Amino acid sequence: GKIDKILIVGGGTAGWMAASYLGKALQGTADITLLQAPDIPTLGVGEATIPNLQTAFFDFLGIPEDEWMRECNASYKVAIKFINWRTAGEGTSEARELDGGPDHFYHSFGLLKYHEQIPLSHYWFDRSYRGKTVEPFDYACYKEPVILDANRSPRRLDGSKVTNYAWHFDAHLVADFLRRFATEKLGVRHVEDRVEHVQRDANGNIESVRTATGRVFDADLFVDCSGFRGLLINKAMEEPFLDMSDHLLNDSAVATQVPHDDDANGVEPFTSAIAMKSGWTWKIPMLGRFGTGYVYSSRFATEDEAVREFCEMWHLDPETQPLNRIRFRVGRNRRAWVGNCVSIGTSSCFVEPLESTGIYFVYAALYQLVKHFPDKSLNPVLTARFNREIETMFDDTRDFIQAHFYFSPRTDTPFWRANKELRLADGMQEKIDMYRAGMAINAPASDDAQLYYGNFEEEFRNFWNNSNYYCVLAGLGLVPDAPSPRLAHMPQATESVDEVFGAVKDRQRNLLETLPSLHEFLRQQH
Template structure:
């Protein structure tokens, strides 16, 4: 056995991020490391709006390795289904409205960014065949409704699986982050004998090389360890505080540094349950709606230089018909950007302490799960080989930059220019990576040409790692850019030379329509499926 192996690790921060980290490491390291979570008393206080959306890899890449059944963790976390993000009124100007306005073409100003898989036809994503049909006047169907099975099911508020638990399509989840943290705390302390210390960080001890040796709390605890994992959230208490690693602020580029949030009662039986997250454009930003059991979490996302908190509260109240005087609002200061190096010496930042792009598109869930897998594959011994940290930081940079491009595309390509917020989204210079992707898209080339078939998601562990590394594939960019009304200049030229492939794609479009009709006739509503899950 390696005498230099890591024997003790301290995770700073409880909450969902800290306990997900503890659970994953406890299982992956097979009990060989003594894990302690330093949890602040504030970590156990549930926030006013604790609803979060995830991406589809959460179960396969996190819960499944822990041996936790999907139905079990869903019930424990108050979870529901998320089969898409529904974007409303990102193309039309006007006041905030939960209902889509009408586009000049007569169609509805909404589109779905589905969690379903974009089909592939003879080596090309179906998106390219769709645009050829549209460019030639052979279809008026929107991209999402033509290429994915899910949109009509979402309109009808149907579940993505049958009552017996069989999946009809690929889906993610909505859940209560406070319940998730509580569940994983109980699971991890019982299953992996993880220690818990409740206290406030007062300082850290360092050796002659600058590495941390122990954390000290205001209550007098001294927690020594070989490795320290910073899950302190936006504070970045170890990585940015103790080690003073610089943080790159991107809130100006992404127009996101604050959210006014609330949790609103909802009659699930009478109104049904949305199997999607809503992202509704409002004059001074955008608002999310995340369905939870008997309520929904909502937040008005904006930039403090352009909008006051009072204005955000007023817009959020108007959007959902709330009494602004009686509704309990809270304000979240969002630290948007990235820590320059997320692994420094023997400290590794995981979650929001490493970086955040705000609440759009569940990037926080993606960053966290990807970081946990990356941490295990790069796990050091007490020599802390610099090559491990360099590789870890390089992969972190790549994932963050790719996700930043995708998030920024929403604001850069939304046609709205009616307010300072929406005009500002067009004034920022696009990052080089996004410029290259936009140029490829306009030329009808694949944006991120990676495998889109189901084997890439449900096959070997290696494919799971590939999914975590680069999830913003061609289908995702097409969903957003086409949904916002931006289209390539022309059809992909090579398709003029592939009539057999075009004919095969026509058959695939017909098959999708047939599958949509069949699923509309057979799937339960999201409400009925969740009632069956929770009540039996």
């Protein structure tokens, strides 16, 4: 028979996302309960997202962007801005000078146009390599950088959208919002209780969960949203966790939230990823405040050193500033789903938030869970395919992230040097090989915005694509060995591409002149 009963263990963000998505997907055909025990609450230190959060998650739920944004005090994200990844020095919020300008580059959500079937990146590098341009890749190929430099809104005062964007918010507010939504609109049962004992049967499946009050919860399917502890997937099911520290040295964070006077300084329409001596710091602007965290490697800095260098960066008192000290569990389970137990969220996998993938990993996995939905016979092929989708989503992100450090030119601290001594995974070395040979890496099948950020399957298959790779690699200074050989056979195309770079320049100038500041737009809403 069908799954009748689902027990979600863990509240927080993944828990209530799971409750909401499953509540919606299976509405009226399964009874869902979430077990949540109270925890020491943390500061809201900020979460950055990607555009398909609206199209894959909130639209699936039937929640308009305006409804959730209002309740979560959200702001807009047009790009990640990478600061000081190429220059030596202390951890500072000001960009250093590099070749006549600030040491920054953007990874934005813009689409990279094709010209005559070839991505603009390849024409850019062709001209760069032959000294016909010295303009950075991101300024040449995307309208976004010029308007991000001026803190522009991604929407006009009349509401019309000029660029792809996503969101900055306090995760706690979003979890709250979803808890209200699941319990009130979807009849998800909320039980405040603490897991004391997980009972397994002779097949290794979870039979039930007994709580500290002595209540027993049985279900056909268990969803582990307990975070790093992995109370079901690791403690009960004994599934091993794969530590990825031969690829990823960062395992810790110190974080806080800082009041901000938006009236005096405006709001930045981007996340900042500020390179540090032994890691990097996020800055996630919200309304009246920003979230910030130094992600660092315990192998290269003590907790005290990280605290001191994070506080000094922001001119905060390390003795009195409210701080979150976090030790992460980096990596993934050998298998995300085992028996009748599916892990979702950090109980499944975690990588540092360098590319804003944390929330995405939750709803991407829920999408895959519903796609591979079992009945009570729990057909093993469903479980196996789900696992393969999760493993690829994680490993590809792990690789992509590793490359941000591996290809930094910095040699100034033990941390930056040690990153160059790690190996890239085989699959990543293959992409780098291709990239050096002038190939696109996972070119999107279409340069259409909507078809990509609006159709989840397409986006899941092609999650890190050529645009993403060139932003990061060319950003850091890794470029191909020579221009794509095809281009020498396309003289007309290399002439006419001039008008494509020109149309980018025009949009850059026109948007810079007509767009209001992000702050101007936010005040109008509120």
